[PDB]
Design an enzyme around this catalytic site. Structure first.
Site, PDB file in Angstrom:
ATOM      1  N   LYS A 307      55.967  30.354  87.890  1.00 54.94           N
ATOM      2  CA  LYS A 307      54.515  30.290  87.735  1.00 54.94           C
ATOM      3  C   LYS A 307      53.943  31.566  88.342  1.00 54.94           C
ATOM      4  CE  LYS A 307      50.556  27.177  88.120  1.00 54.94           C
ATOM      5  NZ  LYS A 307      49.533  28.167  88.557  1.00 54.94           N
ATOM      6  N   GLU A 360      51.007  35.658  80.790  1.00 55.96           N
ATOM      7  CA  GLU A 360      50.352  35.778  82.087  1.00 55.96           C
ATOM      8  C   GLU A 360      50.290  37.251  82.456  1.00 55.96           C
ATOM      9  OE1 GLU A 360      48.903  33.409  83.598  1.00 55.96           O
ATOM     10  OE2 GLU A 360      48.709  33.867  85.734  1.00 55.96           O
TER      11      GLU A 360
END
Length: 641
Positions: A307, A360
């Site tokens: 993440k 991302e």
DNA sequence: GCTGATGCGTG
DNA sequence: GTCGGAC
DNA sequence: GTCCGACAACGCATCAGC
């Protein structure tokens, strides 16, 4: 008469129970009375039906006003990609309320803090604006247009021009209109109804009262011929059609015209997912540990991914060559990343004509070839024409593919979307990389991979199923992924002093909504404000916090309490209560004085995502977490030296 | 020309 | 972003 | 689990005041 409009009554007739004639503009009081009936109740089904009753009347009497009423219900100005913003917050609003009532600004501000609601202040205050002739009543479209007029105001003297429009709305308000005009500008409608309920009410309204009928409408209640069970499943199916279309095209400027011209059942035939139009991204649910992950996903193969601590970047490449980049909230960020636009040819194969990537964007240090913290990424400008001017480089970490070569992949499982992503796209170190992944079901492997992610400057792990319920259909489940962060696990916190309280707004009105926390500086024997705290406690705990801490309110702060640039608390609290607080990270703060000088000459340290754990009844302020300890925890982090 | 307050927006 | 409330 | 609205730190950008 709109004063007596009751969209919550039984046997609501869309034509005869409305408060306006056909073809007339929908009065804003009709929207306000609807807001009153919606906020009174707490069951979403009742709120949906109440709003649906209003929308049915709009569909049957004033179709052109469907869009403004929907935006007023959502408290939005338009499509999210259009990037319209009021430029008005509590500051401009309370000033407009003051000038319209002749009261001192500080008095209006103090009353708004005590009542936790600006709309109540704008309603119980007496107007000092005099008009030679009474103004026409507010309409839904007119009020919506004035909102957009405010958002269009820029340049010098634009603030006063915004206030004039707000004063003009207040002078024409009737009954509860001023309360909701103020709430809309303040951005706190306190309805209890948002995007999902508005969509549910819209589909229910166009199904029971189909649009496009000659007035008077022959079909006003298309459910009366069905059983309750048949009515329920029918409305649920119709609701999914609208929700599945809206998640792929969250643009009411596109759906509503198609909805009114071709109906809901034919809606997916016109509005389809396509590059250049942002879509609702997939989100994640927290998980308290690895054991919970294997329970939610038991009997389903899943993958684990880093993440990354950055900002989401939804990259659309259109047929022809046009590239657009959207944030998680569908904001158009294309002008922000000229470096990414230049990178597109390097990342795709020659057979790739169009795509929608889910990536991302992460700040990347090209000298050290390592990931930079989230704070560095936020230092990028909002408009960069020349890529040579860019100081903070970004590396893209791709993890999903939603659209490829003219075909939507929304209904494909993750295992194949990931297959198509890694087969059709090319990696370049420090520029465009696939997210670090691990396919396993063992607990120890997942634990090691979680620890390896934190060591590699990541928040933790994302967990996503590969084949079962592994599609990208947000309307089925918008939080289909799992996030496993280090700060989620029990036993993996600071004890801080409560030095101040903040009056609560909305659901916190009448009690305390926030608190100012402080650590103990050993060298100076002072309490240094570190962060504010506003979540983690239950309603029962917060009500007891309000009763006991009210006994420690001081007129003036203690001389040994230092807050510097922090928001001054509404009520200063005598230092006594110590609370255990958990956070995700410690940040170098531009305002908080906690541990200033221990790691940075100018900046102290604050807490990222602070949360209340429990009251520390055993400790006094002298035994709270020290500022030196705060500095130690800060330097212990990976990206901090 | 500079700067603090305000607003927007990302986590 | 985290969190708890009402369903 | 869903939907909702309370609340957090901290960055850029705009604008009024200086």
């Amino acid at each position: 008469d709109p004063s007596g409009y009751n969209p919550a009554k039984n046997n609501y007739h869309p034509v005869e129970d409305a408060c306006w004639k056909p073809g007339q503009k929908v009065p804003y009081l009709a929207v306000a009375r609807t807001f009153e009936k919606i906020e009174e109740v707490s069951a979403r089904l009742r709120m949906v039906e109440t709003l649906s009753n209003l929308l049915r009347s709009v569909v049957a009497l004033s179709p052109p006003d469907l869009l403004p009423v929907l935006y007023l219900s959502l408290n939005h100005l338009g499509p999210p990609q259009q990037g319209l913003a009021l430029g008005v917050g509590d500051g401009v609003l309370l000033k407009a309320v003051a000038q319209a009532t002749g009261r001192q600004l500080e008095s209006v501000r103090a009353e708004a803090a005590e009542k936790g609601d600006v709309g109540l202040v704008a309603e119980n205050s007496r107007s000092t604006q005099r008009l030679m002739l009474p103004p026409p009543p507010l309409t839904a479209s007119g009020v919506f247009s004035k909102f957009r007029d405010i958002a269009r105001l820029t340049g010098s003297a634009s603030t006063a021009k915004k206030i004039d429009i707000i004063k003009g709305l207040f002078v024409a308000c009737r009954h509860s209109e001023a309360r909701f005009i103020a709430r809309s500008l303040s951005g706190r409608l306190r309805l209890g109804l948002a995007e999902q309920s508005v969509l549910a009410a819209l589909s229910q309204a166009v199904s029971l009262t189909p649009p496009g009928q000659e007035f008077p409408p022959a079909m006003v209640d298309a459910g009366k011929g069905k059983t309750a069970e048949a009515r329920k499943t029918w409305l649920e199916e119709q609701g999914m059609i609208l929700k599945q279309t809206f998640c792929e095209v969250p643009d009411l400027d596109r759906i509503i015209p198609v909805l009114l011209e071709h109906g809901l059942e034919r809606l997916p035939e016109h509005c389809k997912l396509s590059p250049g139009i942002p879509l609702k991204p997939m989100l994640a649910h927290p998980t308290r540990g690895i054991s919970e992950v294997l329970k939610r996903f038991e009997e389903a193969a899943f993958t684990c991914e880093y993440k990354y601590d950055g900002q989401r970047a939804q990259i659309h490449a259109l047929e022809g060559g046009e590239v657009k980049i959207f944030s998680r909230n569908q904001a158009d960020n294309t002008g922000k990343y000229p470096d990414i636009i230049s990178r597109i040819p390097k990342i795709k194969l020659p057979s790739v004509t169009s795509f929608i990537l889910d990536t991302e964007a992460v700040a990347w240090d090209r000298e050290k070839k390592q990931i930079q913290p989230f704070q560095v990424l936020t230092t990028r400008k909002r408009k960069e024409v020349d890529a040579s001017e860019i100081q903070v480089q970004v590396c893209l970490y791709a993890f999903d593919l939603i659209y490829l070569n003219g075909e939507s992949l929304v209904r494909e499982p993750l295992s194949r979307r990931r297959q198509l992503l890694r087969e059709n796209f090319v990696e370049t170190e420090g520029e465009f990389v696939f997210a670090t992944s691990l396919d396993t079901k063992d607990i120890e492997q997942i634990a090691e991979f979680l620890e390896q992610s934190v060591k590699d400057s990541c928040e933790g792990l994302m967990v996503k199923t590969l084949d079962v319920d592994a599609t990208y259909e947000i309307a089925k489940r918008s939080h289909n992924w799992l996030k496993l962060k280090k700060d989620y696990l029990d036993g993996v916190t600071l004890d801080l002093v409560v030095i101040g309280a903040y009056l609560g707004r909305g659901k916190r009105a009448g009690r305390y909504g926030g608190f100012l926390l402080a650590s103990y500086d050993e060298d100076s024997e002072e309490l240094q404000a570190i962060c504010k705290l506003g979540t983690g406690f239950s309603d029962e705990e917060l009500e007891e916090h309000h009763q006991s801490l009210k006994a420690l309110v001081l007129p003036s702060p203690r001389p040994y309490v230092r807050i510097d640039g922090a928001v001054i608390p509404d009520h200063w609290l005598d230092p006594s209560a110590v609370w255990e607080v958990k956070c995700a990270d410690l940040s170098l703060s531009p305002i908080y004085p906690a541990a200033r000088g221990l790691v940075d000459s100018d900046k102290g340290i604050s807490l990222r995502f602070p949360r209340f754990i429990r009251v520390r009844e055993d400790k006094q302020p002298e035994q709270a977490t020290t500022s030196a300890q705060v500095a130690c925890l800060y330097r212990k982090q990976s990206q901090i030296q």
